[PDB]
Copies of this chain bind each other. A is one copy, B any other.
Amino acid sequence: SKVIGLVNPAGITQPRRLTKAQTGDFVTGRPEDISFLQLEKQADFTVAK
């Protein structure tokens, strides 16, 4: 329950432009640059449950 947006420094998209844009505002960037940090315990979660 902690959203961290990881922006890929090697790319183009940058968060002075995602955030300031109103809704439905075009802005420049590629989608493979921003991702979000998941917590990949799945097999541990199923065995614990």
Contact = CB atoms under 8 A, between A and B. Distances in A.
Interface of A: 1-9, 12-13, 15, 18-19, 21, 23-31, 34-45, 47-48
Given A7-B28, A26-B7, A1 B37 contact: no
A45 B2 CA distance: 11
Contacts of A36: 31, 39-41, 44
A28 B38 CA distance: 15
A6 B23 contact: no
Given A31-B35, A35-B31, A25 B5 contact: yes
B31 A26 contact: no
A39 B7 CA distance: 12
